[PDB]
Design a protein around this ligand. Sequence first.
Ligand SMILES: *[C@@H]1O[C@H](CO)[C@@H](O)[C@H](O)[C@H]1NC(C)=O
Length: 44
Amino acid sequence: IRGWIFGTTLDSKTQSLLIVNNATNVVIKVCEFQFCNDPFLDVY
Ligand SMILES: *[C@@H]1O[C@H](CO)[C@@H](O)[C@H](O)[C@H]1NC(C)=O
C-alpha cells in the first residue's frame, strides 16, 4: 500500500492529487493526471 489517488473525475480537464511513497521520500503532486483504468506502480 504505497500511496493514494484523490480527485473528482480521476481524469484530465480537472485537477487531481497524487501521493506516491518512495523508499526515501513522499512526493505529493497535484496535476491534471490522465489516470489509467487499473493504476499501479511497477517495481523491478
Ligand atoms: C523517490 O523519489 C525521489 C525524488 O522524487 C528520488 O530521489 C528517489 O530516488 C525515489 N526513490 C526510488 C526508490 O527511486
